RNA sequence: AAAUUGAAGAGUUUGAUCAUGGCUCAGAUUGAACGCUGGCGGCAGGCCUAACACAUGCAAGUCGAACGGUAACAGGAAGAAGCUUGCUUCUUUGCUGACGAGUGGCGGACGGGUGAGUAAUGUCUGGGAAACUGCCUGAUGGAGGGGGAUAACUACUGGAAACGGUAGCUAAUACCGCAUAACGUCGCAAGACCAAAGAGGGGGACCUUCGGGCCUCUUGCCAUCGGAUGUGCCCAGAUGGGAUUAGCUAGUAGGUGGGGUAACGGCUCACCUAGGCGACGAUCCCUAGCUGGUCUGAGAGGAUGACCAGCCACACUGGAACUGAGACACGGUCCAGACUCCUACGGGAGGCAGCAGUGGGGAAUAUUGCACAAUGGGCGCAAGCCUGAUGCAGCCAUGCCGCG
RNA sequence: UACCCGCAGAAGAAGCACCGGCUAACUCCGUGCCAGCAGCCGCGGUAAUACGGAGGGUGCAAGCGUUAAUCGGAAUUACUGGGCGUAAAGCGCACGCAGGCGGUUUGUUAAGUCAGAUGUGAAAUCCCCGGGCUCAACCUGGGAACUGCAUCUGAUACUGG
């Protein structure tokens, strides 16, 4: 349950470390993004020699949130923080080449198959 | 491991490791019993414990788990101290 | 076969140890002048019989501490 | 262990061997303990070609040094020559 | 007999001069490049840059004479037949020449690569004393009598793969008691205590349970004291620069005692003393593997550390120990990091600074070759197998020398 | 394979830089402070041996030039082996700790210094005399050298105690 100004950690080796959500994509007046949703981000901290830089403006898919995901029998899976994976602005495909921490099967899209394969763990 | 024998060596060294560990843990136990008697001031318990310990620090030396010199110091050291008290 | 050094006691403070300075003249490798050089050795003095300023005869032995590989042989001259 | 063998010097197509006593693990042309003969397989044989300090070879054997197949041959050959 | 018995100057300030002083040239040298040109050969050299990243092959195996063994192929065999009656194909059985997979032994600590780190648990010279040391070697004795397991395999079962789960079952030079036990370890001594393993080759009376006994020799196993080689440790001197770095230090310096190592040691811990280092350059900062030697110079020096050889250090990065005589392991293990590959999505796998080769960087540096024939290494009684060590071949005028 | 014999025919095998002084090698034409050269000086505005072409010549030769790079010449970091009045260089002056140096005699010591002996200073490399590849490079025997270090024993003039 991510909105504008929200800060997210980063679940890849893109070099970003902290990003801010500056837009929830996918509809007029849309309020929140959750696991599986794409956001627009600015990069607030990045490592020295990575694929991206501080102040760069791009997209990312949310892959872990504190609000969690509901499953069909009523269950909940919650994470201790909010993380995302950086995506090319145009192709919306991953910038990084590795993924860190657990992800959820909600990502099983044509689009995010690469993220679940790379993920250490899939919940 | 990549090479055929390298694989085999890792397997053998693990077996040996669990063998040695077992015998080594046993040995230190019997050494520790002697130091514990000494620290309670009993000649007999400590001599008795030294007599049980002797043959096994000796044997583990013969078996390469430790060198001869280590076995000797243990016997020398404990013998020194137990005599110094009773 | 008794290899040995002679020097004077610059410090006698330590318990059973002493610092000895061995001084010698050496030809300068490039400019030929003869220069004083000093070698300080931590030496063993069981019984602490060596006083500062004493001139003492020392010998090399096994390690006695992190920095002591020498022990006292005997005092030569004392209390100048 | 310690072995007596040929370290191959000389040039390409013109082998020349230096007989040496050495720790068998060191490389063939590497660290040795003592040089003890030489062997020219390309000697004109009009004059010399094979020279062995048999006294020091034996001394080293007496202390357990082993001996190459090729040095073991040279020694039997040189013992035959004189 | 001989073996450092060797040393040059020119142009350029001035109208001209002498002095001062820099710049410049003649010389040797090079792991070179580029431009033009280019016939052959012998010997040598060949990523100096990114310790940048690496597809693919290959670079560490071997022993059936330790062991249960057969699945391959090779014969052999009572007995099935090819039968055209000595030629034979298959059903069988390890009977044996061998041998996949497995246990076991020895080697994977050598050989080969690199110079990142390190101004010192480094190197060089010269000395010390407290130690271990596979294979090889001399000496003297052992090698007795037992026991419980297990891989392979069999049955059932999970995986896409990697690789597993159950219960069976079995061998040994795997593993453990027990005995034996000193010129061994502990101990003043009296005493106390410690090991092991078989496997082959051939054979005369003699004979059985036809396995062998027994006879004999080879070989391996155990103990102890030596030799040889290897390694660990300690001290002194030397081994770069900087003060636009002057103070540094609590395991710090020493002492006692316990622990610890193969061994001396603040190696470690407790307690005690308050020391220890430093202008003869400590501390901090920059740089760097050291040497034999190499180039230059008459020399003294200056510069330098490819190729060869010695020592050290490293093995994707940081950390760790396990096995072992030896490693904190170059093609081993574990954790963490960076990165890459496989996947049926659940999970797996790897580390060229070995030899070729690729991308990248660069002014610039080679073939994904042949062979174990020779020398040398590993295993084996041997035969032999393995060996990108090595021997060779290919490429380049890169250099030296020879010839056209 | 090395090497030896035979066959064919001069047949298939010459380029690079330079020529003003330093520096071996000179003329013409073109250009005209342009285009250009240039290690240093310095060439180019109408005779340019200096630019560019040509002929001629010099030096090298399967190479030749240019660039890079170390040492040399450079006595230009001067230990061997230099300087500071006017050329770069005496601190504006004095006191003074550390340090360097220290008059003269005797005795002593024996660290410096000197002598001898012994061990070590790996091999290769360098050098000398030989040997082997048709020669040479290359390979190789023996020597000499490693001018250094260390221990012991002496010498005692000089320096130090
Ligand atoms: Mg103790
Ligand atoms: Mg003039
Ligand atoms: Mg060309
Ligand atoms: Mg070649
Ligand atoms: Mg290479
Ligand atoms: Mg087999
Ligand atoms: Mg055994
Ligand atoms: Mg027993
Ligand atoms: Mg037995
Ligand atoms: Mg102690
Ligand atoms: Mg470096
Ligand atoms: Mg090499
Ligand atoms: Mg090379
Ligand atoms: Mg080397
Ligand atoms: Mg490591
Ligand atoms: Mg061990
Ligand atoms: Mg190492
Ligand atoms: Mg590798
Ligand atoms: Mg390029
Ligand atoms: Mg002229
Ligand atoms: Mg010109
Ligand atoms: Mg003209
Ligand atoms: Mg130059
Ligand atoms: Mg000079
Ligand atoms: Mg001058
Ligand atoms: Mg005047
Ligand atoms: Mg002046
Ligand atoms: Mg003045
Ligand atoms: Mg006298
Ligand atoms: Mg000749
Ligand atoms: Mg020679
Ligand atoms: Mg010689
Ligand atoms: Mg030499
Ligand atoms: Mg005097």
Swiss-Prot record, chain A:
CDD domains xrefs: Ribosomal_uL14 (cd00337)
Transmembrane segments: none
Key words of the record: Ribonucleoprotein, Ribosomal protein, RNA-binding, rRNA-binding
Keyword RNA-binding recorded: yes
Pfam families assigned: Ribosomal_L14
GO terms under biological process: cytoplasmic translation
GO MF annotations, alphabetized: large ribosomal subunit rRNA binding; structural constituent of ribosome
Disulfide bonds: none
UniProt xrefs under InterPro entries: Ribosomal_uL14, Ribosomal_uL14_bac-type, Ribosomal_uL14_CS, Ribosomal_uL14_sf
GO CC annotations, alphabetized: cytoplasm; cytosol; cytosolic large ribosomal subunit
HAMAP family given in the database record: Ribosomal_uL14
NCBIfam families cross-referenced by the UniProt entry: rplN_bact (TIGR01067)
Quaternary data: Part of the 50S ribosomal subunit. Forms a cluster with proteins L3 and L19. Forms two bridges to the 30S subunit in the 70S ribosome, contacting the 16S rRNA. In pre-50S ribosomal subunits interacts with RsfS, which may inhibit association with the 30S subunit.
Family, per entry: Belongs to the universal ribosomal protein uL14 family.
Functional summary from the UniProt entry: Binds to 23S rRNA. Forms part of two intersubunit bridges in the 70S ribosome.
Name of the protein in question: Large ribosomal subunit protein uL14
Native source species: Escherichia coli (strain K12)
Curated annotation (Swiss-Prot), chain B:
Classification via NCBIfam families: S20
Complex and partners: Part of the 30S ribosomal subunit.
Task of the protein: Binds directly to 16S ribosomal RNA.
Region (Disordered) location: 1-25
GO biological process entries: cytoplasmic translation; ribosomal small subunit assembly
Keyword entries, A-Z: Ribonucleoprotein, Ribosomal protein, RNA-binding, rRNA-binding
Protein name: Small ribosomal subunit protein bS20
Protein's UniProt keywords contain RNA-binding: yes
Keyword ATP-binding carried by entry: no
Annotated source species: Escherichia coli (strain K12)
InterPro entries the record matches: Ribosomal_bS20, Ribosomal_bS20_sf
Pfam families given in the database record: Ribosomal_S20p
Membrane spanning residue stretches: none
Gene3D superfamilies: Ribosomal protein S20
Swiss-Prot record, chain C:
CC annotations in GO: cytoplasm; cytosolic small ribosomal subunit
Gene Ontology terms for molecular function: rRNA binding; small ribosomal subunit rRNA binding; structural constituent of ribosome; zinc ion binding
GO biological process: cytoplasmic translation; response to antibiotic; ribosomal small subunit assembly
Keywords recorded for this protein, A-Z: Antibiotic resistance, Ribonucleoprotein, Ribosomal protein, RNA-binding, rRNA-binding
Superkingdom of origin: Bacteria
PROSITE patterns per the UniProt record, alphabetical: RIBOSOMAL_S17
Alphabetical list of Pfam families matching this protein: Ribosomal_S17
InterPro entries in the cross-refs: NA-bd_OB-fold (IPR012340), Ribosomal_uS17 (IPR000266), Ribosomal_uS17_bact/chlr (IPR019984), Ribosomal_uS17_CS (IPR019979)
Record bears the keyword Cell wall biogenesis/degradation: no
Misc. comment: The strain missing both S17 and L29 grows very slowly and has a rather unstable temperature-sensitive phenotype.
Family classification: Belongs to the universal ribosomal protein uS17 family.
Job description of the protein: One of the primary rRNA binding proteins, it binds specifically to the 5'-end of 16S ribosomal RNA. Also plays a role in translational accuracy; neamine-resistant ribosomes show reduced neamine-induced misreading in vitro.
Subunit structure: Part of the 30S ribosomal subunit.
Protein name per Swiss-Prot or TrEMBL: Small ribosomal subunit protein uS17
Organism: Escherichia coli (strain K12)
Lineage of source species: Bacteria, Pseudomonadati, Pseudomonadota, Gammaproteobacteria, Enterobacterales
Gene: rpsQ
Curated annotation (Swiss-Prot), chain D:
One of the protein's GO biological processes: cytoplasmic translation
GO CC list: cytoplasm; cytosolic small ribosomal subunit; small ribosomal subunit
Inducers of expression: Part of the rpsP-rimM-trmD-rplS operon.
Gene Ontology molecular functions: DNA endonuclease activity; four-way junction DNA binding; structural constituent of ribosome
Any Pfam family the entry gives: Ribosomal_S16
Keywords recorded for this protein, A-Z: Endonuclease, Hydrolase, Nuclease, Ribonucleoprotein, Ribosomal protein
Function statement: In addition to being a ribosomal protein, S16 also has a cation-dependent endonuclease activity.
UniProt subunit comment: Part of the 30S ribosomal subunit.
Sequence similarity: Belongs to the bacterial ribosomal protein bS16 family.
UniProt protein name: Small ribosomal subunit protein bS16
Organism for this UniProt entry: Escherichia coli (strain K12)
